[PDB]
Structure formats: C-alpha cells, structure tokens
Amino acid sequence: PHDTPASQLELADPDFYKIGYVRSFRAYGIEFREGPDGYGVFASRDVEPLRRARVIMEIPLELMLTISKKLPWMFFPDIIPVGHPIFDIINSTNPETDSDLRLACLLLYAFDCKDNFWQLYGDFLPSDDECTSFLLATEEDLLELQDEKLASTMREQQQRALEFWEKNWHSAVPLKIKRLARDPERFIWAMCIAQSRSINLQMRIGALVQDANLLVPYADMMNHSFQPNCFFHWRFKDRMLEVMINAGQRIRKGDEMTVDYMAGQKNNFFMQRYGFSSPVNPWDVIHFTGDAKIHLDTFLSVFNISGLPGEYYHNSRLSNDGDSFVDGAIIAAARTLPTWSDGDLPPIPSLERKAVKELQEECHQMLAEFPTTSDEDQKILDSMPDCRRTLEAAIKYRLHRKLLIEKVIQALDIYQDRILF
C-alpha cells in the first residue's frame, strides 16, 4: 500500500467520535488514530493550496471546561453550583501564579457531576502510567536527566502539589469534597492533566471579551510542531472553537495535522509543562563564555538562511541542489553563537580561523563534562523498550542536548571550507 504517516498506526474505537457526535461535535476531513504514543489526528483527503482557511474541527462550548484569567472568577460552562464548598478552595489561590491548581479542582468536580461529558471522556485521557509529565517522576528519573536546575524545579513543583492536598483535603472536610480526591495521587493526576492539556485564548461570549484558560476536548489530540499546519479560532456566534488549516498550504493524504503549543520557548519549558523534548528547537540556547566571534552575515550566506533576525528561514529555491543539513538546529545556532558584524568591511579569512577553533574548544569541553557520550545514550534507550515513560524522556533530553552541541561542531567546520571558495 501507499506509505503514509498514518499507515503505521491503527484506527481508534468508533466510540471516541460517537460520544462527541451526539452532542454537536463535527469533524471534517479528518481521522483519528492511535499508536504507542497515544492518539493523533491525521488527514483523509487532499487539499490544494487554498485562498482562505478551512475548518477541520468544530467543538461546542458546553463540552469544554473554562476559567477566566483575572480576579472575578467566571466559569463559562458554569458547572459549579452557588454555595458549594469547592469555590472556597478555588478562591484561595494566588491570582497570578497558580492557574494550574484552579483548573485541577474544576476537573475533579466534573468527574463527580452527572451528565457531564467529562465523566465519559476521561476514560480516554492518559492514565498514571501513560502520562509523561514529570510531576509524576521518582528520584531516580530526576537524577538521570543530568541537570541540576531542571531537577530542582521539578521537586519544588512536586511539593507545591502535595501541600495543597494536605491543606484543603484535611479530616474535617465535608464528604462532597473528600470524595473528589481521597488519595494524593489523584490530585497529582489532575494537575498533570491541566498543565499538559491547557490552552489559553481570548473568548467573547455575548458582549464580554475575556481572556481565559481552558481545557478543550478533541483538540488536545493535536501534536506540536514548529512548522505548523493548523491554528485555533473562536467563532462567537455559535459559541464554538474552530481548528483550522493555514492558508496557502498543500496537505496530502495521510499527513499529520499539527499545532504549535508555545512560541519562542526553550526545551527546559517543554519538559516542565509537557515532558517532551525536540532535537530541533529553533530557539534553544547553548552558552559560550568564550570571547571569540564569527561574522554574522557570512554565516547566513553559506547556509542560505534568509530573513530578519527574529525570523530566520532557509530559502530552498536558492538551494537548488537538494540539501538537508540545514535544519532547525543550524537556525538555532545562528542566534546563539556570539557574532561580530561591523559596517560592511569583509572578514579576514585567517583572522576568523582562530575563532573557529577557540569556539570548538569550548564545545569539546562541554561534551566531556557529562557522564556519558551520545552513542552510549542511544544504547541505554535501545536496551529497554518498555520502561517508565518518564525515564525514556529523561534519557532523550540528554541525547538531544548533546546532539545539538555536536551539530554545532560539524557546522562551524563547514563554514571554514566555504569561506574560501
């Protein structure tokens, strides 16, 4: 058969869609498939380059769970009754930093309220075993990462979650409150789901325009990319969220529909919120305290990176000969390496050669400080296929950091050869 990204994966139960379809959820030109990773959204038809955007999914407001960002707290689907004990817990949270906690509490209530889509949908959400969030990680996994700072942050976060459970789920609490989170692991699952699956958007319901934090069903099955096919839009009149294909992009059958979770952020943040890391994060930083600087403009020219500093892209028409070396990481490189660009005077070739070596020296030092080499790491990963999901994540963070340092060495060298035609 045809090779497509979707082919490898298997179709999900008919019931994922049905539960939604009876309520007014509609999907157009899309499927849904499952695999070891979890659910993902794929295409089932070909769309030619288009003049304006096309809707792939429409999700109504009632299915969702939502809280406002600012102080008067307004919950739009409005599940919570007036006078219920849960509001006191939600009200006593710092307005600025903790929204994760507020969202967790709401989700737990939803599981206890009858005829709420969530009672049915939660069955499809990730379990304690299958979620990659690091809130659910042991001392050992935290150790494997090999980073002191990421590790520390995670522990402070794990403690913040426990403290809340102890303070509010004490002995005297009314049973309505107790049933919602009897054990402390349940609170943690909820915070894990809130952090990993939350979306922030501005919504207009009626005449009120507010900014909110929301948990939305069926749109959480999209995956991250830094070169994204689709986006999220609020249609006010029918009170719905629309997921839409970007204008001008050809999409072929079997392809993966993707969205971008946060923009401009490094791999450390992705791990704290989502437990995912990318080999190519265009925005990652490798730090050199070394004095030397290569000239900027030339860097761009050899590797055909065009654009303003904020937005760098590889022009591929200029690169008639099919190239592949230039990717997210070479772009990442441009931003990080210290550079000198002055006036229009051209760089002296010998003068720069000194710089390349001194810079590479720092890279060798960096790679060495770590306990294991890149090839060693692959081996550990390959050794055990079934393992705690958090552990595979930690090892993969390491492989990725190292691999970017290595790519830079390879790249700085190619500069040398091409400076002199």
Write the DSSP string, 349-399: HHHHHHHHHHHHHHHHHHHHHSSS-HHHHHHHHHH-SS--HHHHHHHHHHH
Q: Can you list the pairs that 343-347 forms with residues at least 24 positions away whose Cβ atoms lie under 8 Å?
A: 347/295, 347/298, 347/419
Chain centroid to Cα 32, Å, comes to 20
Question: Considering only residues 12, 30, 55, 74, which one is a binding residue for other proteins as defined by CB under 8 A?
Answer: 55
- Provide the minimum distance between the beta carbon of 249 and other proteins in the complex, in angstroms, as a whole number: 14
Provide the phi-psi class of 248: left if phi over 0, else alpha when psi is between -120 and 50, else beta.
left
Q: Give me the least distance between CB of 209 and other proteins, in Å please.
A: 12
Cβ distance to other proteins smaller for residue 37 or 297: 297
Nearer to other proteins, 56 or 180 (CB): 56
Question: Can you tell me the distance from the alpha carbon of 274 to that of 288, in angstroms, rounded to the nearest whole number?
Answer: 28
Smaller CB separation from other proteins, 21 or 113:
21
Q: Segment 279-318, which members bind other proteins (CB under 8 A)?
A: 297-298, 300-301, 306-308, 315, 317-318
Candidates 51-59, 125-133, 354-362, 383-391; binding stretch for other proteins (CB under 8 A): 51-59
Q: Which one-letter amino acid corresponds to residue 385? A: P
Residue (of 209, 267, 34) closest to 130 by Cα position: 34
- Interface with other proteins: number of residues (CB under 8 A): 21
* Smallest distance from other proteins to CB 237, Å: 5
Instruction: Decide whether 54 or 335 has the Cβ nearer to other proteins.
Output: 54
Asked if residue 54 binds other proteins (CB under 8 A), the reply is yes
Separation CA 189–CA 113 (nearest Å): 18
For residue 386, CA distances in Å to 8, 27, 144, 260, 390 come to: 19, 34, 17, 29, 11
| Total Cβ atoms within 10 A of residue 340 | 12
How far is Cα 275 from Cα 269, in angstroms, rounded to an integer? 9
Does 322 sit near other proteins (CB under 8 A)?
no
In 3D space, the residue among 280, 279, 334, 332 whose CA is nearest the CA of residue 302 turns out to be 334
Report the chain's C-alpha Rg in angstroms. Answer: 25
| CB 28 to other proteins: min, Å | 6
Asked if 248 and 50 touch (Cβ cutoff 8 Å), the reply is yes
Count CA atoms closer than 13 A to 162's CA, side-chain side.
Answer: 8
**Site map (CB under 8 A) of other proteins, residues 228-267, x = contact:** -------x-xx-----------------------------
> Nearest approach, Cβ of 40 to other proteins (angstroms)?
22
Of 49 and 371, which CB lies nearer to other proteins in the complex structure? 49
Question: What mask of x and - would describe binding to other proteins in positions 26 to 45, judged by CB under 8 A?
Answer: --xx----------------
Say whether residue 175 binds other proteins (CB under 8 A): no
- Is position 46 an interface residue for other proteins (rule: CB under 8 A)? no
Nearest distance, CB of residue 273 and other proteins, angstroms: 29
Q: Of 205 and 300, which CB lies nearer to other proteins in the complex structure?
A: 300
Work out how close the CB of 29 gets to other proteins at its nearest, in angstroms, rounded to a whole number: 7
Positions in 334-353 near other proteins (CB under 8 A): 344
Q: Nearest distance from residue 317's CB to other proteins, in Å?
A: 5
- Least separation in angstroms between CB 45 and other proteins: 9
The distance of closest approach from Cβ of residue 291 to other proteins in the complex, given in angstroms and rounded to an integer, is 25
Q: Tokens representing 320?
A: 């008639």
**Contact call for residue 50 and other proteins (CB under 8 A):** yes
CB contact at 8 A, 102 and 90: yes
Contact positions vs other proteins (CB under 8 A): 28-29, 50-52, 54-55, 235, 237-238, 297-298, 300-301, 306-308, 315, 317-318, 344
